[PDB]
Ligand binder design. Structure first.
Ligand SMILES: [Mg+2]
Ligand SMILES: [Mg+2]
Ligand SMILES: [Mg+2]
Ligand SMILES: [Mg+2]
Ligand SMILES: [Mg+2]
Ligand SMILES: [Mg+2]
Ligand SMILES: [Zn+2]
Ligand SMILES: [Zn+2]
Lengths: 491, 491, 491, 491
RNA sequence: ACAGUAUUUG
RNA sequence: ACAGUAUUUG
RNA sequence: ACAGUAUUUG
RNA sequence: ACAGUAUUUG
């Protein structure tokens, strides 16, 4: 029934649990975005090291870097600067010491994009202290005015946040001040040493939150744990939006905060693969290796509507999940199938208009002739899956598991073929129990069959209870090289 | 290196193994399509029953049917006929007895499409003995001529197969003969009884093969098992392409047939999720709930090419897998990312030109601005996954598994919330072992924490070794209704 | 180094843990007997019900009884009384209502001995209020005098405890008083109702202890838990040895009581099968179905001594374990093997002199010519094993497990023999995994072998991971009665 | 119903199965002794090596020997000879090279008795070619005559087998010939080399059988496998009892030999712990570490008899099992409990008279006053248990398993005590799952309880599913030396 | 296997 | 398989 | 968080 | 805890 503005939008902080410090942004009781920072596996994006270059490969158009973790980090010739600046190899003289920062974070293989293009964020500003090229405003929005009046040095260009819109030129000075004043240290704190090492560490979840996600609509900030609420308050001081010290309250209620604001289930919502649409429909969000791929579908009085209407809900919800899951990359949405075009353009907008908030960039094509709508969106941090799951290790990634016989027939032809391989003595499949059962009954005859022909080739087939139903081995044992050792000792 | 026509295209039949009768269609040694019919789980599509109608729902635009299995079968008002014919409810008078056939087969939920629009296939013909509306030819291709000269009765219209192109009008008579002559029986064999029952059973894999997949290019038909080769031969007789009795030879070689033609690995190929591209690239074929979704990617001298070239291979291979997997529905292909448009149109065609064969219909849009190419293709039978796998039952479908702590924190808030629920005595999470470990150490304090506050609420938390890492229960035990019974007895 | 009398003998009570209330009797720091009463599985021996008689069997020389639990209770014609008294059947008129008490307790099969011969114990006395036949004194020990002066009614006879030896005739009156005064109620509290039901419940462990195990040598009684120490004190009051209120002190020390008195390990000692002898020898206490059977053996300067000496230690220790384990029945001790007879008579006495305490009766023959010394001892309550263990359920009782092959050969001949049994179709061994492995490799040939001969008898052999290494089934499947169902589905 | 002599006594050989060559000795259909030789784990007793002496210990009264396997072998000063002969140390000069043979075989610890007192067995004779001291006859039985007439050299003395009783002096010459003629080689075949090595290998099971267990009563010798029956026949030739070539027949019957002679079950009989007595009684044969211990008990018309009679059956059966199990050492039999002494002496004899056969020596005392009858018997080879089982590895030997709580309480006090141990940080019980469950619910409070007091001592308690119910660890973690690492990662 | 095939629809 | 066999003894 | 943002790229 | 206690006996 929801109209933005009806109830109060508040920022619920949840500092009760050590191993997990959550921060939802709720409007009334509709969770509408959430964050879960937890020690150890902290935030790395937005840091700044010093850098020398493992290896210029050109077959990609960029170096790598040692900023010294595990995997040296990706660095596109595009990233590279005036100042680093004395096609690839003429550009970067290798083992060169450079001031690289992290655009996008380790993803299962890759390093991370670094970029010698350092960016710096205050509450209302953002410094590019290293290319006076790019500036601007919150493409979200007097200060256009005030901005000129900005006393900017020339090496770099700047933007002005969505959230400086309230505020007063005086203090953009008072931002663009404290930035620089960093940026300086952030400079000479490299002029120091051999660079192979960190320099600045992007600040925790809360600050970040008080920084990047706080607006005029934010009613209260209930924090549920007095000692945080401590730093809580000090952190505004600095970040400096101090018309919010008002705004920041301590939750006492015995009933757990989030669990009070009735947004718990919503939290989960985000970890489930299906997600119910108001009407009663559903939104199954499957994630492939090429693109996340959401599919939509309907409940249980009209057809045309049923679909059209349920598509609109799907629209709304998909957006929110997009946010909750920190889903990035492409996304293909399979909207139901309505006939009248107006509906298509209808829902399309519906989507657009619903992802208006999303702090990340979002691009949204028309609906296809196969009724798929593709849609990109920017990789603001690691996604929930990518950072709170892993890979059903029975499957490998895929979520099916080969029916027992078709596996066995298979294991079995493998055996036979192995058992021709000139100069084999034994050969020793080692397979999930039922596999071994099925080969040795259902199929015994065949196995037999073999050794008869393959004169004198023993095909051992030992059933085992460690193996699950898709894994297995088929080793082969060359003349002479054969233990006498028990079938079941084989392992 | 492959040019169609270089080596001989042959049909390898493999009748050695009872529980699995395979039939690849190979051109030289490149498997290029394959079939695996196995008893029991036989073929159902293309059958013909008699039919009465469980329930007209109109909120879909069609009935259902009892042709008497498990799930009565889908029947679109579109399907419905003149003759059944006395918007939905005025159309189908319910419990009406009708002559329905099966377009598309049981899929995990659905019934199957039936269609009162019976279709009938000979070797060169295909009878529509029930709408003289639709006719035509093999949109693949003198007989245009011969076809008129066809002595067709009027109730129905016909097509002429790709494969009657060789042959002679005389014998289209001699097809369109034996069809009808069926179609008659196929008619009065309903005039018989209460209809709730089968009528005609689509014939096995081999016949089918000798029927639907045999052309002029087919060199030999090596069958590897004398007794089949028996029926083998008799089946041409009838189907009646007898200039092939020549063509059909018995394989003796000790080394297993397929394993001789060096097409084994290829067989598998089709069951793996990644599949290597010639160059050395790879084609990961992930399947979601909305669309199958293939992603492509490259090896280890130029960029532009590396991608462009590897895309072409992906093209080729995707086609073949599309066929081998009997993949239907939509498919989204994430081709690498080349800049020059010519390349895009290049690969696109490449794809088109490579799926020229595919017996199923295929539609192929341009490459998107997000560099996805979407692509539909017709559901010719059940897909390999859909009929030789199942659902990594540790995951549910999805192939990740929630990291242990984030689960535990979760299980745990559930407990707490349950333990407020006014009028609870005990409450009894029952969770995967490590879950129970982690809640009871790492987190003990918190659990404690609870019962302290929740005065006198026992939260039992019994670790169990039956449960795997994502499943678990959190039952709650109402005042009075509490056994005294051992923590570990809980189950 | 231990001389009785050196250090103080004290009674350590341990009431900290709810589910287990222990009471050791220590002399210095040598645990010398211990008790472990724990709720639920409480003490039943020494109770008194009312009784009617399920069934006179005479093929044993006694009835049974309903005192109404599970197994009606054993009742020897020997037990039976004057007053019950109107060879077996002439004696007990069946369904007769009687005042039976419990000599010895449920043992895995048996009921328990009841006895219509009720016995009653005070602190210094013991009433036989139902046969003036048997009287006496503590065959352990002026009162001989005082005892005559006892104002005894005539229906029954009495004894005087080891512990009335201190005390004064006045108060044996004051015992033999409060007894009777019970015994009366204990009488008319049957004159009440239909008897099928309890009457008096033998009192808990502590009272019992303050009653049956308290002497002049008992220095303190440290109890470690204030609230018990409460009832603690009240319980002397009554039982009435009140020159002990002095004696009974509260333990505070942070370090756990028993764990302070340095008698913990000793506790366990009693649950282990081997038990180290001072010198360094060992005492393996194995328990069979016919007799508990202790074996002795030696360490690592003389032979003759080494053995003789180590036998003496074994003597000492065996006694104590005999007590700790509440071991009853026969016991055979295999003392080392010394040559000189003096040593044999030496150790024998050593044993005698060491089991002087044992509250239970003990009888001790000479050492045999096979150098076994047999030895009976009275069943004072259930034994530790019999009440705190169970039966290595992999073995059945026996503690070996048949080597894998000898089992398999066996399972296998079973199969063959089953497979002759005229009119069998299938037959379906179902066996521990490795069993199934070994039969199907190592032995395949043989299995084959069978079906060849046993024309057309399928011997299925399904390996299974539920079964451990000694269990298994060999079902057989009669012509006609054969599912087609998967080898591994068999279960 | 069995009277010795009624049916034919025959020797069934069973050479069908490679991994197990059995040889029962049956009288009619009553298995009455059996043998199971199987390759690899062959027979070692009765071999002859050459020998030098690892280490004279005197604290035992004998050396050891290197005859070079694993454990050098026991060698009693008693064993030692004239000829080895230049109290212990003056006797055996160490590292001396000697001609030792094996009396009794490796038993779980020990070496084996060797004995420089070599013994040698023909069919009718037995050479002591190394002490003319000991001679004699079959204390089982003209030849007394013939024996003098024996042309014996003087260094050694001899006996004459039970089975030379048939036969003729001529041929005792013809035995005592071929012996010596060995004994010579058996001598100079040491005069050869450095002794550290074998010399003569006691011959397989069959020969042995044709040698040590063949008498006049032996009707046939059915062997069931033509090729054996081969060597079969040749082996008499040599051993030389050739009036038996007659006697030795080939079994053909399709139904398995033993399984035909209806003695299968009997085979097993011997591996079960209970064994039914004719009447319907039972004989539970439990084996301890001190003595094998058989207990007896009765069925379901008189008492006195019931017992007396059932004791007689037990007698019979015990004997046979004694033989089948190759049970050696002491044995204590708990016969039922009859009153009249005649019965005791009755059964006693019954036993004596029934173990008349037993090839091993047997000694049998009167029945005790506790109604145990002890009984020694000679260790003719390893016992069935000792060579075809192992140790229910859940128990350790003992066949009970400590009830779950009493374990947990225990594990738990261990924890607490560990957690006082000055200078501990963490401490980390690791226990069977249910153990961990029970400590963490049932008992949580207490565990808590601890850390509260033990200020700042973390007691981790990780449940684990590898451990079964009696095993477990309680490690302790010293200040400073503490990983931060997950509860469930602990292992 | 046909211009309404294919996709979609239970 | 013997009067010192057997049991025991590592 | 800016017209070159985002997607892509290890 | 007694001279018929204890062992045994379901
Ligand atoms: Mg890609
Ligand atoms: Mg997937
Ligand atoms: Mg859909
Ligand atoms: Mg008994
Ligand atoms: Mg045992
Ligand atoms: Mg011993
Ligand atoms: Zn999975
Ligand atoms: Zn066991």
């Amino acid at each position: 029934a929801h109209i933005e503005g009806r109830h109060m939008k508040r920022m619920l902080i949840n500092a009760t649990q050590q191993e997990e410090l959550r921060v939802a942004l709720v409007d009334g009781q509709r969770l509408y975005d959430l964050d879960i920072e937890s020690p150890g596996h902290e935030q790395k994006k937005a840091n700044i090291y010093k850098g020398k270059i493992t290896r210029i490969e050109p077959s990609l158009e960029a170096a790598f870097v040692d900023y010294g973790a595990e995997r040296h980090g990706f660095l596109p010739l595009k990233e590279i600067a005036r100042e680093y600046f004395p096609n690839i190899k003429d550009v970067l003289r290798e083992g060169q010491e450079v001031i690289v920062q992290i655009d996008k974070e380790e993803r299962g293989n890759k390093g991370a994009a670094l970029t010698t293009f350092i960016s710096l964020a205050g509450s209302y500003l953002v410094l590019m202290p290293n290319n006076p090229r790019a500036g601007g405003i919150s493409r979200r929005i007097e200060l256009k005015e005030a901005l000129a009046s900005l006393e900017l040095p020339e090496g770099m260009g700047l933007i002005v946040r969505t959230a400086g819109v309230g505020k007063s030129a005086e203090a953009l000075q008072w931002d663009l001040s404290f930035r620089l004043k960093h940026w300086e240290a952030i400079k000479k704190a490299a002029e120091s040493r051999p660079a192979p090492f960190l320099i600045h560490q992007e600040s925790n979840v809360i600050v970040r939150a008080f920084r990047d996600y706080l607006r005029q609509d934010i009613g209260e900030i209930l924090i549920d744990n007095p000692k945080v609420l401590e730093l809580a308050r000090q952190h505004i001081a600095a970040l400096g939006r101090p018309d919010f010290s008002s705004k920041i309250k301590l939750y006492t209620g015995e009933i757990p905060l989030f669990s009070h604001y009735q947004i718990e289930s919503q939290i989960e919502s985000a970890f489930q693969r299906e997600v119910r649409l108001p009407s009663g429909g559903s939104i199954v969000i499957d994630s492939t290796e090429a693109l996340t791929a959401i599919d939509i579908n309907s409940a249980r009085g009209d057809i045309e509507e049923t679909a059209f209407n349920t598509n609109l809900e799907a629209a709304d919800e998909i957006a929110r999940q997009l946010r909750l899951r920190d889903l990035g990359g492409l996304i293909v949405i399979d909207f139901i199938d309505m006939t009248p075009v107006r509906h298509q353009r209808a829902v399309e907008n519906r989507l657009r208009e619903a992802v208006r908030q999303d702090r990340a960039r979002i691009q949204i094509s028309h609906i296809s002739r196969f009724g798929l709508l593709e849609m990109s969106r920017q990789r603001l941090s690691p996604s929930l899956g990518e950072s709170s799951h892993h890979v059903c290790p029975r499957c490998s990634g895929t979520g099916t598991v080969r029916d027992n016989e078709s596996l066995s027939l298979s294991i079995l032809r493998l055996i036979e073929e192995e058992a021709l391989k000139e100069n084999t003595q034994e050969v020793h499949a080692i397979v999930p129990v039922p596999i071994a059962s099925y080969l040795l009954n259902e199929k015994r005859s065949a196995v037999n069959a073999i050794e008869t022909r393959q004169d004198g080739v023993r095909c051992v087939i030992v059933p085992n209870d460690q193996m699950e139903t898709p894994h297995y081995h088929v080793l082969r044992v060359r003349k002479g090289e054969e233990t006498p050792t028990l079938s079941y000792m084989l392992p």
